[PDB]
Symmetry: C2
Subunit: 242 residues, 2 copies
Amino acid sequence: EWQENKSWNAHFTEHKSQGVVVLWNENKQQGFTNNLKRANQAFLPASTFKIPNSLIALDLGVVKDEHQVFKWDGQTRDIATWNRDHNLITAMKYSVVPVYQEFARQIGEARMSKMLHAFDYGNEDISGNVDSFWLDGGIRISATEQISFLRKLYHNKLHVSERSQRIVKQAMLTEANGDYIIAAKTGYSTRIEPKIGWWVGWVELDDNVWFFAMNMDMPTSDGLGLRQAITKEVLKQEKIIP
Amino acid sequence: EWQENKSWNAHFTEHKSQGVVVLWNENKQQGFTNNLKRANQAFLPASTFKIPNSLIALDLGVVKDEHQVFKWDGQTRDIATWNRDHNLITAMKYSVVPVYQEFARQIGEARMSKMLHAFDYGNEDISGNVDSFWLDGGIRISATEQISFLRKLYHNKLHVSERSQRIVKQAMLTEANGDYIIAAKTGYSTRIEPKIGWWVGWVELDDNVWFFAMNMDMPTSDGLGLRQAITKEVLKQEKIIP
């Protein structure tokens, strides 16, 4: 149905920010957002592309399972958590780009494009570098197109093995307590303007699930925590979480 | 190697309790506990049997997936969360017995028996009723045997489809944040003495996983929260969690 709820802008305003939060009630099959336009505008997926990247790597055997280790290449990078060994779990937790760049190289241009056509993922355009097109290439995806994709993943309906889809949905685990579960992926697009931060995924409850996809103008890494803060505030406002 | 650590007993003392906490460091392959004896004593698994029960139900088609709904039977029981509809996820969260009793009935005595031999689960004895043997029957399992079973489950090495094992491990999810993930199942044996409470599962960390299995004497429902409290105290003491 897609309903606008401009009251949420106050959460962006209070932090001198601009963005969009898109919610989809799976049960009632209804959508909500503070900005219907920006909800369908396509941006670089940045590290949220690690979801489909993992799916393709797993389905193609590039990655055996989620426990396979990827030795650090010894190149000390300016993010402390990247200078370690990683599996698919932690590689996604810490948005460890160089690991997913090795994935994309082995996947290749033909298989990557062929699988994103099947996934019906964003504009399906991998133009650019095989190992960086989601950071500075031609791939583009909207917040609504993220939710549409996330619903396919949630229900194990993508053109990859169900196993691939269950492994990734495990790796997307972010937060859980007696009230809710959040499986999601953070992103930060910085190589091409406008710089934006991402958070996409869903909130699982006892009796329902709420898919969400938000992005916000993000000129500095200092405000990245607002991706979750603003999102959680909207969830409280809608009484989806305490 | 298995080393004893009776210092943890102080966490039982301060709460007027007696019990055992058994830990297994997967990476270093080392075990720790405050009481090797009680760590090898076999008790009724109670609702912790919902783990092997789910695996068997899923593998035999009794349960299609984790989203399939199981209508309330209308029999109003004295636990409010039982008097509603449930899927495999919520049924396990709330230890919804009548749902898993229906699972066991459709599974049957013969298949249930064959699968617990495959799982190598406890004394493998279903003597009694197929729909209550884990509450008042002949099945018995120790805290170490729990860990041994949980280790096989974690690595997808039980004699059932990997799919079942990935679904159940999703259902075991209890608590997760940026520091750790806990997948576990609570239990409460009350129909046969000694009354005890259970907590079994594992703490997943960036660089390790710690399998744990605890039981404690539980004469009253007032102390059930100590299953997690006492366990978490031992986890803090070993710097496994903050």
